[PDB]
């Protein structure tokens, strides 16, 4: 009963199958949080495992560019995952408002995303759901820190061991190996980084179709390009890092560590 006692619920931030995220205040502390509220009334054994998995992964990850679990509280019929509140809104919103980022701004943004990803991978965590909606800005001030959020689809892996872990992710950001239904792991996250970096620089995605089956065909084939006019003044080094991220063969795809040493990120 530690949640009902100490915390007051305010506005809804988002909604899932069996869950809700709401701003909350720890009343006696005068401090606000993001409460993920999971309804556990007659929850399946599998859905319990997925709650426990997310709790375990979120406790594991301590990094400036990853949302921080503050507490995990089991009450009768509800579970509470309390996270530090990030108030600058989604990277998605900021790209749409600004249209696109400068190469300097994009590099600084993608650098922080890669540090979050590197940390996850080093800790045996694959997110599987990287996209601008899942990256939160620390504030509305320019250059404010980016935080990886929403580990609801995250998996635990054993070192470099890969398997068919099942079909999960967001269409525009899905890796070819997930769509092919082939073994996968940490590299899926780097494919998504490539989609995000592409979006940062020109403000529209590399893969899009009204027909999902045609979208999947373009992703599986790596059928992206750099059309005029928006790509006309973009450096080849930016394109090079995107190409290495959007590599079909996950064995040959650039890693987080390798990406952070790419000149377009490190010589800067």
């Amino acid at each position: 009963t530690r949640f009902t006692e100490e915390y007051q619920l305010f506005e809804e931030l988002g909604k899932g199958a069996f869950s809700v995220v709401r701003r909350c205040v720890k009343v006696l502390a005068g401090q606000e949080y993001a409460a993920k509220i999971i309804n556990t009334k007659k929850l399946s054994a599998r859905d319990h495992q997925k709650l426990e998995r997310e709790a375990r992964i979120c406790r594991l990850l301590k990094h400036p560019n990853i949302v921080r679990l503050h507490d995990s509280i089991s009450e009768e019929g509800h579970h509470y995952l309390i996270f530090d509140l990030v108030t600058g809104g989604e990277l998605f919103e900021d790209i749409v408002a600004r249209e696109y980022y400068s190469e300097a701004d994009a590099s600084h943004c993608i650098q922080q995303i890669l540090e979050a990803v590197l940390h996850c991978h080093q800790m045996g965590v694959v997110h599987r759901n990287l996209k601008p909606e899942n990256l939160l800005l620390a504030s509305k001030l320019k250059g404010a820190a980016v935080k990886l959020a929403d580990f609801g689809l995250a998996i635990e892996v054993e070192g470099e061991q890969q398997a068919w872990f099942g079909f999960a992710g967001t269409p525009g950001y899905l890796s070819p190996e997930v769509l092919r239904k082939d073994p996968y792991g940490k590299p899926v996250d780097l494919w998504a980084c490539g989609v995000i970096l592409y979006i940062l620089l020109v403000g529209y995605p590399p893969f899009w179709d009204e027909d999902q089956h045609r979208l999947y065909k373009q992703i599986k084939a790596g059928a992206y390009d750099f059309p005029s006019p928006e790509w006309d003044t973009v450096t080849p080094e930016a394109k090079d890092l995107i190409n290495k991220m959007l590599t079909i063969n996950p064995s040959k795809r650039i890693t987080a560590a390798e990406a952070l040493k790419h000149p377009w990120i490190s010589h800067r």
Binding site: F92, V96, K131, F167, G169, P171, I199, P205, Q212
Partner: peptide, 15 residues
């Protein structure tokens, strides 16, 4: 022409 749109996650194959 390609557009930036919000998209929902899938936790299983959806045709």
């Amino acid at each position: 022409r390609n557009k930036l749109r919000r998209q929902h996650d899938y936790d299983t194959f959806v045709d």
